Amino acid sequence: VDTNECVVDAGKVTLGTQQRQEMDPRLREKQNEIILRAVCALLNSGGGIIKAEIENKGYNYERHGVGLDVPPIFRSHLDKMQKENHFLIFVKSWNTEAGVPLATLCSNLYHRERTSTDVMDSQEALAFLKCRTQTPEGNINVSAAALFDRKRLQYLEKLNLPESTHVEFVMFSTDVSHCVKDRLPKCVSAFANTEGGYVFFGVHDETCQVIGCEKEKIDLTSLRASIDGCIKKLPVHHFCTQRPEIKYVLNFLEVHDKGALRGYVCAIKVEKFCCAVFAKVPSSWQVKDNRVRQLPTREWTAWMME
Ligand code: NA
Ligand SMILES: [Zn+2]
C-alpha cells in the first residue's frame, strides 16, 4: 500500500454492490483488506485521502453503490467520492473515538462466553487489559477432565459433555496442519483470556459426536510438536513480574469402530493466563516512514494503555 497531504494509493478496485457480489472472491477480499488497512492507518495518522482506480467500466456511484465492508464505528470518519475512473475516500482522524486510543481492525484477543468464542472489540479489549493490569480457584470442569485423559472413544458416540465457557468442540479440516494453525490460536487465546478450558479437535459441535481425524492422516509426535510451536508462537503481553509461558496439556484419544482403531481426537486443556494472549499480532495500522505499517504487539498495547 503505497503512500505519496497524506495520500494513500490503494491500487485498482472493483466498485458497486452488484459488481463486487459477482467478482472473484479472493480478489474481492484482497481489495477490501487493502482499503481497510489504508483506512486504519490514516485514522491513526491524523487523517488523509485514499485514492483508487475503478477498474470496472460504466461504474456510477449513485446508481451502483459501493459494496465495501467497513466496520460501522469507522463509517462516521469516512466520506467517499467518484471522479470518473477514480474513487476517493476522505478519512478523518480517529481522535480518541469511543474512548479507545487508536483504531484497530482486529484486536486478535479472543474470549469465550457460553458456546461462542469471539474476538474482543476495542472497548472489550481495553476493559480486559485494564483488569489484567490491576490484579494483585478450583477445578475448571471435572467432566471434561474425565474425558480428556481417556485412551479411547467410539466413532460417532454422542458425548454427554456439552460445550460451555470451558469446553469447545472443533472439527478437523482436511489439512490438519492448517486446521491447527488457523483455529487453535483463537481457542487458546480465548481460553487463556477467559477462565481456562478444554478444546476437543475431532468432535462435531452441533451433534457433540466423536468423529476424529483418520489415522492415516496423522503423525502423532509431529502434530504434538506443531501444536507446541503454534502455542509458543502466540504473542502475549504481561503486566506481571514472573511472566510465565502459556500452560496447556495435550492428549490424543483413539477413535475405534467395529473393533479397529480408525482415528484420533486431539484434546487440549488451556489454563487461564495471568495476562493477555493474542491469537496473532493485533491488526492495527499507521503511516510511518512513507509506508503503511502494522503496529507491533508491544506498541499496540502501549497505545491502548494510554
Ligand atoms: Na485428565
Ligand atoms: Zn503475566
Author numbering: 7 to 10, 13 to 144, 165 to 334
Which passages does the manuscript contain on this structure?
The Schlafen family belongs to the interferon-stimulated genes and its members are involved in cell cycle regulation, T cell quiescence, inhibition of viral replication, DNA-repair and tRNA processing. Here, we present the cryo-EM structure of full-length human Schlafen 5 (SLFN5) and the high-resolution crystal structure of the highly conserved N-terminal core domain. SLFN5 binds tRNA as well as single- and double-stranded DNA, suggesting a potential role in transcriptional regulation. The N-terminal Slfn core domain (residues 1–336) is followed by a linker domain (residues 337–552) and a C-terminal helicase/ ATPase domain (residues 553–891).
